């Protein structure tokens, strides 16, 4: 409950950064997140930003084109149908080949190649 006259000081913001960096070192990642939830609910001035953006390659409000479909059940991007993470519609940032969040988790348990033929990227194992 300190005000916006000593919480904006350089000294106090240095201690916060070092503690957050220290937590990342101990591999206590989920504990760091709970701390940022508390910080978010108390100091809105340090809110994060968006990192995702949809940039259609054609113009799609202008080109009237849909986003790509999954490589297993082939249904398009957005059509409907706990276990709600399954239809999360993940992506790949190197091969530009995505699909339904749960469909490849079942497929990647026995193979190590991109579902799309004529592509030689091992999507999951590239992280490690």
């Amino acid at each position: 409950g300190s005000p916006l006259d000593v919480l904006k000081d350089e000294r106090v913001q240095y201690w916060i950064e070092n503690y957050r960096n220290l937590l990342d070192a101990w591999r206590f990642w989920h504990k760091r997140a709970e701390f940022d939830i508390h910080r978010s609910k108390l100091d809105p001035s340090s809110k994060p930003l968006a990192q995702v953006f949809v940039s259609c390659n054609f113009c799609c409000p202008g080109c009237r084109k849909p986003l790509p479909r999954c490589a297993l059940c082939l249904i398009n991007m957005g059509t409907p149908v706990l276990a709600q993470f399954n239809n999360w519609f993940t992506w790949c940032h190197n091969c530009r080949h995505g699909g339904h969040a749960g469909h490849m988790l079942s497929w990647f348990r026995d193979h190590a190649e991109c579902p799309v033929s004529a592509c030689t990227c091992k999507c999951m194992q590239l992280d490690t």
């Binding site: 479909r69 398009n76 059509t79």
Partner: protein, 285 residues
């Protein structure tokens, strides 16, 4: 095994077609109603209802799952109604009445081309409704396509761009074969005429890589003709009879690999054909 579902209808039943995965069952009828039955481990339960088309129903055809859950209905009323469904309920989506005579048949196009629906109505015309997107459709027309009106339509398997081809035939027993030029016109190519009076149904065999295009036919005079051709690009269509029953033949169907043909006509019966090594079609059951 044998699976049976009670129709619970009050009037006749004209057609019944299942779904792509084998997990649905649609029923058209003359009660001006469609009753979708979920068939799974032998049990008849309802999922929807079609309480109104302004007339009896004739033929329904399910669309490819790639594009969602789409069902079409061509019937007596001069209207073709689609049933795109959302959020677990079946709802009327779009209709058009581009005819002045009862719609005879509808057959969904191959999925490679897009989501196309051919409509052969009884007024000597064919309308191909293409999906433009954003809830809009385009309705083409080819007037004076028949002198008595096409009874039924069929789509040709897709080959390697692309060249759209489909087959149709009317009540003048002059079955023809269409085509589409680069501009967009549905130019005519040929006209087979080895039929007696009328041709009710026309069916085109699936393609599995063999260099041979096979077309079935069934005339209002008892005859099941297999119009095989294997002349690459010489265009030689040589009819070959298979039988001649005691009454009118109604519907001809194919298998996935085009090894069995099932023809059920006016005799209130269904017989299963084949293609022997010698080259004669015999019954099995």
């Amino acid at each position: 095994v044998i699976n049976t579902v009670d129709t619970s209808h009050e009037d006749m039943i004209h057609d019944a077609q299942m779904d792509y995965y084998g997990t649905r069952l649609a029923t058209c009828s003359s009660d001006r109603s469609v009753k979708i039955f979920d068939v799974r481990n032998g049990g008849q339960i309802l999922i929807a209802d079609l309480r109104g088309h302004e007339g009896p129903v004739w033929q329904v055809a399910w669309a490819h799952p790639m594009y969602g859950n789409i069902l079409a209905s061509c019937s007596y009323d001069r209207k073709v109604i689609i049933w795109r469904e959302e959020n677990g309920t079946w709802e009327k989506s779009h209709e058009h009445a581009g005819h002045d005579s009862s719609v005879n048949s509808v057959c969904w196009a191959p999925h490679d081309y897009g989501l196309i629906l051919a409509c052969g109505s009884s007024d000597g015309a064919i309308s191909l409704l293409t999906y433009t997107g954003e809830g809009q459709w385009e309705v083409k027309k080819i007037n004076n396509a028949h002198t008595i009106g096409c009874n039924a339509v069929s789509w040709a398997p897709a080959v390697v761009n692309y060249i759209k081809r489909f087959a149709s035939g009317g009540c003048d027993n002059l079955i023809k074969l269409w085509k589409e030029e680069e501009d967009g016109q549905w130019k005519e190519e040929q006209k087979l005429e080895a039929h007696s009076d009328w041709v009710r149904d026309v069916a085109w065999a699936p393609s599995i890589g063999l260099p041979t295009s096979t077309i079935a036919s069934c005339s209002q005079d008892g005859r099941v003709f297999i119009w095989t051709c294997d002349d690459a690009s010489s265009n030689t269509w040589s009819p070959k009879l298979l039988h001649k029953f005691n009454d009118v033949v109604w519907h001809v169907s194919w298998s996935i690999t085009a090894n069995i043909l099932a023809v059920s006509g006016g005799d209130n019966k269904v017989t299963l054909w084949k293609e022997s090594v010698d080259g004669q079609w015999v019954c099995i059951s």
